[PDB]
Design a protein around this motif. Structure first.
Motif, PDB file in Angstrom:
ATOM      1  N   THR A 171      -7.722  -0.244  -2.629  1.00 24.36           N
ATOM      2  CA  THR A 171      -6.845   0.852  -3.026  1.00 24.36           C
ATOM      3  C   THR A 171      -6.996   1.293  -4.495  1.00 24.36           C
ATOM      4  O   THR A 171      -7.061   2.489  -4.785  1.00 24.36           O
ATOM      5  N   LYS A 172      -7.052   0.341  -5.421  1.00 22.82           N
ATOM      6  CA  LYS A 172      -7.093   0.695  -6.841  1.00 22.82           C
ATOM      7  C   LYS A 172      -8.232   0.059  -7.646  1.00 22.82           C
ATOM      8  O   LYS A 172      -8.279   0.209  -8.866  1.00 22.82           O
TER       9      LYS A 172
ATOM     10  N   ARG B 282       0.810  -1.218   0.000  1.00 17.56           N
ATOM     11  CA  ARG B 282       0.000   0.000   0.000  1.00 17.56           C
ATOM     12  C   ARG B 282       0.851   1.280   0.000  1.00 17.56           C
ATOM     13  O   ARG B 282       0.402   2.337  -0.455  1.00 17.56           O
ATOM     14  N   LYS B 283       2.089   1.156   0.474  1.00 20.59           N
ATOM     15  CA  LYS B 283       3.090   2.213   0.355  1.00 20.59           C
ATOM     16  C   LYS B 283       3.601   2.333  -1.088  1.00 20.59           C
ATOM     17  O   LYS B 283       3.757   3.445  -1.599  1.00 20.59           O
ATOM     18  N   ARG B 284       3.848   1.195  -1.743  1.00 21.70           N
ATOM     19  CA  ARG B 284       4.255   1.178  -3.159  1.00 21.70           C
ATOM     20  C   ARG B 284       3.141   1.680  -4.088  1.00 21.70           C
ATOM     21  O   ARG B 284       3.402   2.392  -5.067  1.00 21.70           O
ATOM     22  N   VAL B 285       1.902   1.303  -3.780  1.00 14.68           N
ATOM     23  CA  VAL B 285       0.737   1.733  -4.558  1.00 14.68           C
ATOM     24  C   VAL B 285       0.517   3.246  -4.448  1.00 14.68           C
ATOM     25  O   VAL B 285       0.232   3.910  -5.452  1.00 14.68           O
ATOM     26  N   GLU B 286       0.664   3.782  -3.234  1.00 13.86           N
ATOM     27  CA  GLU B 286       0.601   5.228  -3.008  1.00 13.86           C
ATOM     28  C   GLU B 286       1.651   5.940  -3.860  1.00 13.86           C
ATOM     29  O   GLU B 286       1.392   7.026  -4.388  1.00 13.86           O
ATOM     30  N   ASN B 287       2.817   5.306  -4.004  1.00 15.26           N
ATOM     31  CA  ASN B 287       3.919   5.852  -4.788  1.00 15.26           C
ATOM     32  C   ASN B 287       3.842   5.449  -6.265  1.00 15.26           C
ATOM     33  O   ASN B 287       4.857   5.408  -6.977  1.00 15.26           O
ATOM     34  N   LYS B 288       2.613   5.156  -6.697  1.00 20.53           N
ATOM     35  CA  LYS B 288       2.253   4.883  -8.097  1.00 20.53           C
ATOM     36  C   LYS B 288       2.962   3.677  -8.734  1.00 20.53           C
ATOM     37  O   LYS B 288       3.097   3.596  -9.956  1.00 20.53           O
ATOM     38  N   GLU B 289       3.391   2.726  -7.912  1.00 19.84           N
ATOM     39  CA  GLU B 289       4.013   1.511  -8.448  1.00 19.84           C
ATOM     40  C   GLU B 289       2.994   0.529  -9.033  1.00 19.84           C
ATOM     41  O   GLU B 289       1.848   0.440  -8.570  1.00 19.84           O
ATOM     42  N   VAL B 290       3.425  -0.187 -10.071  1.00 19.12           N
ATOM     43  CA  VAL B 290       2.620  -1.235 -10.677  1.00 19.12           C
ATOM     44  C   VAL B 290       2.825  -2.501  -9.865  1.00 19.12           C
ATOM     45  O   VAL B 290       3.954  -2.841  -9.500  1.00 19.12           O
TER      46      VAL B 290
END
Lengths: 364, 364
Positions: free
Chosen positions: B292-293, B235-243
């Motif tokens: 999240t997405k 969820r930290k990676r997703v916040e930072n727009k990671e795939v």
């Protein structure tokens, strides 16, 4: 339009061909093939010093790994020479693999290795399987075409055969989007390695509707005893709605620009030998194909005559296409990686509607 | 409108998959993989009698030619396993080549040989290169899946593992147009041979963006020791727009119907073995990606877990995708030859406008 390219323009006037802006007429006239391979793979026409270093580099890359030699020796004499090249490259991919970074620089080194060694792969397999000899791939020959001819005939070719080989390979080096190039690009686009993208391309070029053409242009040209009797048989074959191979082209509407170049080469090669038989037959059927069908000859019409005068076996025509075209492929693979836009292919469905499952006993 | 297919529909309702009008949900619940192979390659769901004969035919096709063995033995231990398949299939095309006619019946013979021996090619190489052993590929296992696991592990698998392989391979068998399938049809559209079409497809599938998404899925799941921790990092990676690999699909807008099926498979495998650490992480991350997405998991998310529970090395994930998808490719090859319509792609041009030739000694 399947993608963007900076590599090649063809048929905008109905009869033009350019490699990175340069006219093929100028390129065929002045360049060694290696200059063109440097233009495509390394991006630019090399200086004199860049050419020297490049030709020395390529000269040292003509060798075959011990284990690749074992792979080649295992492939039977009756193998399609295209499948021999496909296997050798594949084995080489396992032996000198691309680094998992996939650098532009690493891509070029593989390109350059393939370019230098494809002749060696083919002809080493050929002479072992057909003649029982393990030849030396690492010749003193100064060019790719000249290396090819040496390894094929067991002797250095004339300065004349070497120059014509330069012209042949240049004419075949690049042709924008076609089946083989497009394949290389689709494979590059998944993030796959150079070898794989080149190996799919080779498989596409093996198909007679793509890379086979001139193999049968020679088959048509050799049918006939005289230009008169060729004329009679072909206009008979065209009246029966036959497609004569070596004529017409998807993109070009007026002429294939490479044809006039290859015709001139074929003419000189036929003259220098002293035999213009096959050339006069091809030249006649060219006139006849225009009268009958309004079709112009493509590159694969007279390349048949020029290659055959140089004693190239028919089954090695397409392999030569691979030695030339690997340079475009390598350019297109590299370009695809840099702007890795993908056009997701999708189909039109014509199968059956959703239907209930039938159990195994229920279908007897 | 890249081409017509009678083979498979994908996401007409948004969450749906059919092989020749049969629902994937039904196939995966009721079919041996051999039965789906038969559906794609031979056109119909087999009667009991036809399956008995098909399995007897495939069981006897597991062998490796003397020369092909020699080829596999030359491939170093560090070869990409996909490059091993590529080479093996390449050498086999030289050994048991398609007859020049390219009849439908001969194509299916090659697809069947390839379906039965792809596991032999891979694992003979592995066990020779890695363990110094010439294994016997012609075992008494009664399914492709079960055969794979025998040669990988050195022992017959449990009934449960066999059935899980059946299901996995059904799920990966066919998926309409995509990079690997379209490659197989491009190569086939030149009139090239089945091996060439398959070899290019393998090249495409080897790209991490296409063939090995479940390998990176496994890497993700194995970063973490707990669901709580997995959730924090993703969820930290997703916040930072990671795939996050293993989620989303270009065709499905609602769900991947294959996901539910492999999730159940992975749950049973993880419970029978003992460990659920990986499953509870994958299952947890599924929830996180939804909140999240609003991204659903695609098949490559849980197939990591299930293959892992069956002791399959990560580098053998995509090789197993080949064993499954070779059925779809073969059916797609057969189709392109029937309803034939060229290759024909074009590009838009961005390169340099017509420029003057500079002769070599005058370049800088």
């Amino acid at each position: 339009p399947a993608g963007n390219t900076a590599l090649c323009t063809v048929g905008k006037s109905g009869n033009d061909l350019h490699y990175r802006g340069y006219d093929i007429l100028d390129l065929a006239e002045h360049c060694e093939f290696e200059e063109v391979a440097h233009l495509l793979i390394h991006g630019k026409l090399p200086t004199r010093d860049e050419l020297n270093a490049y030709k020395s580099k390529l000269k040292a890359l003509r060798g075959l790994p011990a284990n690749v030699r074992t792979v080649l020796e295992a492939l039977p004499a009756a193998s399609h020479p295209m499948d021999v090249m496909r296997t050798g490259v594949s084995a080489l991919g396992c032996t000198l693999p691309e680094k998992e970074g996939h650098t532009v620089s690493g891509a070029r080194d593989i390109a350059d290795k393939l370019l230098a060694s494809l002749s060696s792969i083919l002809l080493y397999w050929y002479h072992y399987s057909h003649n029982g000899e393990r030849i030396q791939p690492e010749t003193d020959d100064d060019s790719i075409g000249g290396h090819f001819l040496h390894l094929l005939h067991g002797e250095k070719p004339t300065q004349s055969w070497e120059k014509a080989m330069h012209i042949s390979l240049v004419l075949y080096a690049e042709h924008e989007f076609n089946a083989s190039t497009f394949t290389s690009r689709v494979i590059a686009g998944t993030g796959s390695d150079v070898y794989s993208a080149i190996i799919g391309a080779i498989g596409a070029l093996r198909g007679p509707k793509h890379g086979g053409a001139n193999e049968v242009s020679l088959e048509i040209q050799q049918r006939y005893e005289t230009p008169d009797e060729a004329e009679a048989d072909i206009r008979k074959r065209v009246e029966n709605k036959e497609v004569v191979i070596g004529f017409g082209h998807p993109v070009y509407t007026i002429a294939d620009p490479r044809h006039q170049v290859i015709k001139r080469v074929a003419k000189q090669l036929s003259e220098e030998g002293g035999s213009l038989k096959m050339y006069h037959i091809a030249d006649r059927l060219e006139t006849v194909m225009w009268e009958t069908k309004k079709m112009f000859p493509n590159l694969d019409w007279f390349s048949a005559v020029s290659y055959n005068m140089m004693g190239v076996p028919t089954e090695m025509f397409t392999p030569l296409f691979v030695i030339a075209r690997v340079t475009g492929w390598a350019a297109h693979i590299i370009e695809q990686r840099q702007d890795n836009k993908i056009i997701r292919p999708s189909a039109n469905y014509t199968g059956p509607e959703d239907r209930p499952f039938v159990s195994i006993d229920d279908r007897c």
